[model samples]
Target: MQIQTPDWVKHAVFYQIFPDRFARSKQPRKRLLQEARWEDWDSMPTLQGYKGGDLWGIMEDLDYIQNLGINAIYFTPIFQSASNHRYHTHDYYQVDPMLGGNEAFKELLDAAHQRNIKVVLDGVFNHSSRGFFFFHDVLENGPHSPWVNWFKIEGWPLSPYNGEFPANYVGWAGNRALPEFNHDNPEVREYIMEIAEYWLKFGIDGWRLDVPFEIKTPGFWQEFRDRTKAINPEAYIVGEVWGDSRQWLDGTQFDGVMNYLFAGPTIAFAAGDRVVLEQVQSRDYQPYPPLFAAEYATKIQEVLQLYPWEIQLTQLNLLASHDTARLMTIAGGDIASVELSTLLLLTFPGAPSIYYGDEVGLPGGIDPDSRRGFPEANWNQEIFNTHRQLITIRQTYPALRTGDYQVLYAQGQLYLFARTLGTEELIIAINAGTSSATANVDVASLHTQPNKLLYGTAEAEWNGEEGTQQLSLTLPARSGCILGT
Candidate 1:
């Protein structure tokens, strides 16, 4: 069920785009003024209201993504839907007409390829809208319909799972808006496969499956893998399993899972909420294994060992995402903290994803607040320029692109890690503090000779010693340093 994926994706960076707020379609003011309010947008029974986010607008930002040196984009749902999240898909074959339909998507892809960027659409195969074809069949034809078994309809006429409305369901999708799909049913599985393959034929790079765990049907994903690989092996398939994704990744159903566990702490630390950050970094490198290394590093190593290196390398890692508060807000809107979080993402294992507008210090919040449009925040040319420089460095340096990693120092809001590709090594030191500090490392194991310091703003000198190399340095509040030795 698996195919040969291009190695390029292993090192490529991904940027997520929330299509709803990225751009406007045919008439910008037309959709905005028509149903602009959130209550109105959420209440009115449609796939989703248009508040001016569209594919054409994203097309215009190719240079923006390319300028940041990223190779792929993970866009949120754009299919015609009744929810802002677009998870309640109404039509599988067409991009929402409000956001520039199939033609607009094609144009976006054409432009993305020109910039050497790949586009991955958000796939919501686990559920659909109340207006979906199968849902309508279930309602109108009862058990006699071909799609009768397509959904989880309980006992009698007043079935508990009432058509995706916020009624008798266990979770959010029980409402009349976002109906859940029964992935176990053959009829449902075939329909999903057809839609996935249809888009692959339309020339998309791949898909990011939303909420894979909730679907609970391995067979559906297996078929997705077989069909997608059969058509385009290079097509990426990421999932939205927010926690430890190894369970799903081990099944060969997903290329990678959202690195919330890995990336969340770094953002938390940058936000001055250093509790969890302290635990993760501390356990990273220790004599008897740092306190919680068992909890953190074990999971990472488990997945890497459980699967081939190919899968581990292709894993998607990130800090900020649409579902959570923006990274800028998490960083207290401080440029230093933002840079620190970015450095951690770059130095860590797996490919890092920069949420859309994050590189430019965009700001947003949760739910009704999270979907704020891009180009709305006060753009900082310096922040965007910094990302451009660092991203280029990440891509060009072999040590960063495909190196093995090891944590050398971790304690008290400070971390030192190394990425090595054979003889070449890149060391990253991050100080999540306002003051200066020092670390005594026993680099005798790494080497005993005097190695050139590659790059860092802070000043440090090490005496050629066997037991300890003294490193003394100062860092501005929430700053990081990268060097080579």
Candidate 2:
């Protein structure tokens, strides 16, 4: 039976799962730094050992994820990689042995579905781990390999190739372990589509394509879209585009793109940038500290605003991911900054994604540093409690989930945006400044029965005492607050 993916996803919460370090099936202790216990191959935490975070571990934490108000899980690639991250794929058909194989995945599915959570996986087809298919041939039969024809090569040595190597070739990481494939190859295209179809047949909800824009062959993605949708129309395919992805969401190529542009600039500005950001602050207003203004970060927001708002509506809004530093570490262990960022994500138009451990306040720095193990407490009391409350408000109030958006108030360091869906309206105010600022709100302009501030610890009030109430409240330094009429 084909499962119905509800439109609620546009209104749903997502919990990211980095499988390896989430749960240790064999660990005798509950702490994250205990003697690594799980699989022998994954025993070492620093370099070699893979923590025993198998499907079973996820099974153990299903309740925790569910209680966090998440309706979906975006699991990173589990397609059998030689390394811990699994960016490189050795075999697309099998689950990594370190992750408990197919049977364990089945159990995980059953548990997740019981809690009404949809699962999406990372699709790393732009390149593959060393010695998979094409690479194996190129390495073994260099001159005579039939596979050699399926790549961007120049000259006799085929010295200049595309993607995998930066040696004369243009790509990101310079390593033969990840060789870029020729998208134009009919055989390659058909093979990838089959792999996607194969997983869908096994009941995967959808796929999150890695480095989608890099695929030069436009036809390949269109074909992929056709085949996957034919099996499940509701299955969503999101491309991991680090910056602006408005161009790809023209309705044909991808259902969505991972919106790093939104979070990246926000963080960069938080780290220090001066400019008026979009859907964020008013172009004319100036915030305090001058250095705290998101003005320098406004360049990207301006570029994105050139298009219709719906261009990238289904974006995966994030605070941090495996590629960037952890939110906690970035904030120097200050939990308040993370909360401020979360408010922006939850109330925004695009769908939001919670990196594996941000909700619990774990520190993620650089690459290897960012890959810190999952929160030991199945549910972090502070972060989890915050999510529970905010998510409840988002679901109970239509404006927060799928309402019409409007920037209600803006100042040098404060921005108040609202979402109105039918009779429901939500106003999300972010205090970009260190202290607080009071702004004006036009009550008549809003459609909801005003909002009923049912939760939150802020004492701020807006729209009242005759003409549009003065929403002057002391927003904690570097913090955010949600106010309802």
Candidate 3:
């Protein structure tokens, strides 16, 4: 199979929005009947409390997303569900009524396309809530329920609540709230395929599938890829695989993955010992034991080689997301750490996903905390400017988007790399050390030299003559620079 991925993804910058916590419209079409239970926007987010952020709220904030140099948006589960996160999908066809329903989705889809911004919805095929109609029917009717095969029912008297019982259906992570789907059933497979196709026809650009690896059915993803591509060849299907995902990237299932391979190393190198061990100790991606420049470069090279160049360019690269603690919190509120990491994220290959409030220096630890409400005031201007500047530069240069990367030099705290695309080229260097560092790297093999500093707080100078030419780069404590023609 020939590896193919969406071209737009290679050039796009994504903003990941957890809908329920992102924003709430001043006036919605229909206020929730359970308004008494909804939490105030300024209050601390709890595991179960609703912040009232809806689709209309996202539509209203289109300008904010667009202005931040984001051409794509990836929203976490928006399907109807009782959970605040909406991962326990109750209805695949119906958008949550609290989230403005199907009507709001149509409106937002149209609005986003008008600005040429692509929208990718979260797909949770692994499980469904007990509230899901079919599952509810099973709960009420037991073995007599026709929808029994839709989920993995192990034995008699299915326990939706208590896992202590011997015979029970499986949950995603052993949480009884989410009943795992029985992929062995063809009907269940077809149901999922229809849902995927329905949304594409409804105008969603792509899908950010949740735990795609959970569906162990053979050829399931292959057919899904065919069906989605048949609808729109440009459709992107990205899985949430944390580490090496070579199995899915073999020109079949997903365009790319939520690249923790990139995330872990970048954070480890940039933040160093500042990373809060308590925050990431239990997370899927661990960015601990601080890495030097040589190790960072090696890890990056290995990551780039894990998939084909086509897939690498489309990987959903991110730092911190809703799953883990925020970058600010993880790095112990080090602004320099965030700045350096942001610079690396934007300039590197693939679609860099900015978790909603990260640009404004939002800090949170763990799940519900990480999924905090976006604030109106107390914005971090310095960090926001850093993100905007890097994003703009990424958009401006093709080399930064689709360029072939080469590590020109890597030693101690200084790492130098080149992103070259035909006539366009960019030399990027960073110093993760606390003190200033300088390096003179030979660019003869690269066949290019930096004319000037493209971005960052750094000094650059052209050294030596042609053929034996070298680039002298200097970076301040915990800083990076992008030098280009």
Candidate 4:
């Protein structure tokens, strides 16, 4: 069966925004006076505290986001929730008042679209929190509640809070605060579908489903795909799966996944020995056991082969996210690690996602820490420049975005590959080692000379006749380059 992902996704670069930590408007509205005050912007984030960043702040910074060469925004759970992360969604239809409510989201959505930036919200369909209306109904009315089956009711006196009694139902990862939804219940399935449709109808671009693998009801996701597509055929439905995701990319269940398969090995290869184990130890994804160029090439080939070209192009490839430590922190303060990995990320054939504050040299470890407020005052010019420059190169060359990937050479600390689309070709070469390295690659098969350097700090030259050319390229340690016409 033929499959198709969104065409826009192939060329789009995304930025992930953790709503509560990204930014807030300087002018607070009288509307917010009724809600609880927020902690100081510079204050260290805690497990349960809020910094009060909202959609309006993001609207105010659209120019900043666009300047970074991003065209899409993926926001983590913005619906109504008691938690700062909002993963424990209480109301699917309501954008949390603390996040400036539904009115704020409507204006932000329009503003983002006017700037050509598509907005994708996080869909938390797997479970909800104790504050959810139906769950609270069960907690209040016990077994007699009409919505008792809305969640799995194992026992009576549902002690959601103060575990004086068994919470009586299963929670996601055994945490009582986040109660798992009973997908087996048809009512729950329809309710989730309605929420998805509601948002898409509200002019949101797509959805980045939160832990969607947990919902196992057969045809549940297929139905979701059908309904979501029915409304907007171009809508992108990506999941937050950290491992192999072939099961969801068959043009039936979902469009693509978060693609941690790319993240884990890419970090191991780029960061190598500098990978601080403590940064990624507790996470579901691991980018450890520093790899040689050969090993890294093998892993990359496996990922490229895992899915169809359509799925690969739409796969959400990210180095780090709100769920894990910042890439800079994971690299143990070596900017090269982040730089090398970022080079690969932008040049690779997929939609690259930059976690908020990562480009400007923000560092944190794990959750709560990883979700620190965006540092507004401090900026690392070198890293930021590198990001903007490479992002421009990616946006300029269609070959890098949609071209065929071919490994030209892989040895020691150097790996070279060719991206070809029709007559256009780009050779991306990297030296991930601590010393300069040179590699000679045959261009006879390419049938085109890739002699000119397109980007990066590397040197490239062609030798011999045009038909039988050899590309001799030298790259500095931890530097990568793009070569093309």
Candidate 5:
């Protein structure tokens, strides 16, 4: 099937915000405190504590976000929930009151759209918290409840809280707090689809579906695609599949997936020895053997063939996200590694997503810690400046986002590629190595004159006459550059 990805996605530069930690408004709407457990902004985040970040806060920071050259925002789950992450959703319809409720979201949506910024919310549909109305009803009436068919309930007294009994119900990863939905039930399926359409009609741009792979019913996602696209054809539906998402990207189920496949090899090559072996082993998503440039090229080549060009442009490319450690932390606090990785992330295809605080070099390891509050005082200005420059360059060059990609050169720890769109041509060379190196690129085939340096960590001088067959340039150690003609 020919995929027609959202045109806006190709030109998007996204900033992923974990709402509870990104920012807090000076005046939060006074509502019933869920737990009265608020943590200091600078303190380590606990699983249950909230920092009071709200939609009103995001509304106030549009200028700040716009200043970063970000045009789209991917917010983690914002629906009403008991946990701070809101992944364990209590209600699919209501915006979390703590985040200033549905009214605040409407305001934020309007404000963001007015600024030409798109908003994509996290959709946690595979499971819901034990407190969900349907699940609560099941608990209240057992088999007699009309909602008993909503979940995967086994026989006998349900013990959702303790493991002393059989539990008798299927919860996500065996955590009683989350009960997996029974999608086989028509009413359950209709309810879920209705919620999805409701949000689309509510003016949200798209959904970042959480753990979409777990819903095993056949054609469920295809129906989801049909329903959502029928309402708003441009609405993006990106799945949370971490690896080998080719099955989902055939222009039916998902437009694209979270591109961890891109991140894995890029991090392995850029981070090199900075990658922790234990960290790589802990998560199924993290895959690496500290690839050299040649290995990284081979990996990229294989994965790029896994999807069509249209689908490729819509992939949610990122260096880090809420599920993984911050890129700097994963790179063992090496700013150069993070910078190199960011350079590759920005230059490569797809809508690049900046996990909040990554540009400023915030560091954290694993979850809960990775979900730390955004640091205000402490930040690496150099990294932030590099990101700003890269984003500006990316937005300026349409070829970078919508051009044909080709590898010009690939040797150990030194990689070069080109993006061509009509008469425009751009070359990106990255050296993820320890020492400075030189490459004599054959640009005669380009049929265009090399102009000026677009952006780079090191100064480079290309020596070649106009229409010459070769262009030789030297790159600094641990650096990359983009050249335009």
Candidate 6:
């Protein structure tokens, strides 16, 4: 199959928003009803507490998102569910009533598109909540249920919520709350495909599929891709594979997977001391170990070549998400470390996703906490400014989006790379060491004199004549520079 990654994705600066925690409806529509129990907006987010955040709330914040330099938004899950995260999907067809219902989605889609921002909804196809209609019928009717084949039922007496009997029906990870779907059933497959198509027709730009690897049904994803692209050829389909996703990115199944491949090495190199081995091991997917500049470069080079250039450009690269510790927390509260990582993230060859509040230095460790409500005030100005600057530069330069990544220099603590397209080029240099380091970068390969300091906090100087000149950089401890011609 010929790869056809969306062109818009290459230039997209994404912002990942966890709906229930991102923002609450301040000026709620008069038609909206209070359905879920509302929690204190400033309180710590628990596993089940809803803060009354809705699509209307996100719609109200469209200017906030657009002004932040993000061109795309990826929502976690918005379907009706029992949990705050909405991952335990109840009805794939209905947008949660608490989230302003299906009407609010239509309003959000229109409003967002007016601002030129693309919206991608989370798709939980592997499993659903036990409350889902089909599952509920199976629970009510047992052996007589017509929807028996919708899920994988191992035995007759289905014990969903009691300690008295075995919960024979397969739930995702054995959690009775999320019943795994039997994709082997054609009816179930058709239902999921229709749900995907329904949303595309409803105006969602794409889908960020959750735990797609867990769906062992062969040819299922390929058919999904064919069906989705048939409706909207530019629609993006990304999976949630944490590692070695070569099988899924063959220009058939997915445009890309959540790019832990990029995030791991980045965090390892930029914040080595804070990446606790035990904490890292506690996670499902392991990140690369703390790396020196050379090691980081090698790993980067390997992943850059791991996929076709088309898929690589569309990869959803992220430093942190709802699953792991916030990047600032992982860096042990060192803002500089996060800034350096942000610099790398925005400059890298993929669509970079900024987790909500990350730009303002929100700190949280792991799951429920990582999904904390967005801070309303007392923002981290330094981190916020750095993110804006990097995003601005990345968006201003086309080369940063579609350019070839070439390693100019990589040693002990100093790493330099060039992103080039035609006559436009940018040279990024970083010093992750505790001590200041200097490097004389050869500009011969660049074919142009890079005399402009696009962005940096450290000291730098250019010497020699144009074309024959070598750029001399004196990077301070934990600092970086973006040089341009």
lDDT (10s digit) by residue, model 2, range 1-485: 22222255677677778887777555432223334545643554442544547777887888778877888888888877775648878888887767766767777877788777888888988778554766666656666878766654433343333544343222225554566777788888888899999988888878999878888786777788889988888777888776556567666667777666666555544433332222121221122123333452353346346434543455667776665566666666655666766766777666788887787777665644435665766445786667678877777776676676666555577666667777666666667676756655565566444444555445556445645444455456666667666
For model 6, where is the 10-residue window of minimal lDDT? Answer: 40-49
Model 4 C-alpha lDDT versus the unseen true structure = 0.85
Give TM-scores for every candidate, taking all chains together and pairing residue i with residue i. Answer: 0.83, 0.82, 0.94, 0.94, 0.93, 0.93
Instruction: Identify the runs in model 2 with alpha carbons over 4 angstroms from their true place.
Output: 1-6, 26-50, 152-172, 268-311, 378-380, 448-451, 460-462, 465-476
Please, what are the lDDT tens digits per residue for candidate 3 over residues 441-481?
87886666676777876875656788587778778888888
The clash numbers for all candidates, in the given order, read 14, 20, 0, 0, 0, 0
TM-score of 1: 0.83
lDDT of 6 by residue, 1-485 (tens): 56789999989999988777777666424323434334432232431344557788888898888888998999889998875749889999989877867998899999999999999999999999878999999999999999988998999898898947888789888787789999999898999999999999998999999989998788999999999998998998989778899989898889988898888888888877767544452454455567888999999999999999999999999888777777767777888789889999999998999998899898766744534655476578889989998999998998898899999889997899999999998889889898999888776788776667899856767568774667777889989989887
Could you tell me the C-alpha RMSD of candidate 6 in Å? 3.9
Worst 10 residues of 3 by lDDT: 41-50
TM-score of 5: 0.93
Greater TM-score among 2 and 4 belongs to: 4
Cα-lDDT of candidate 1: 0.67
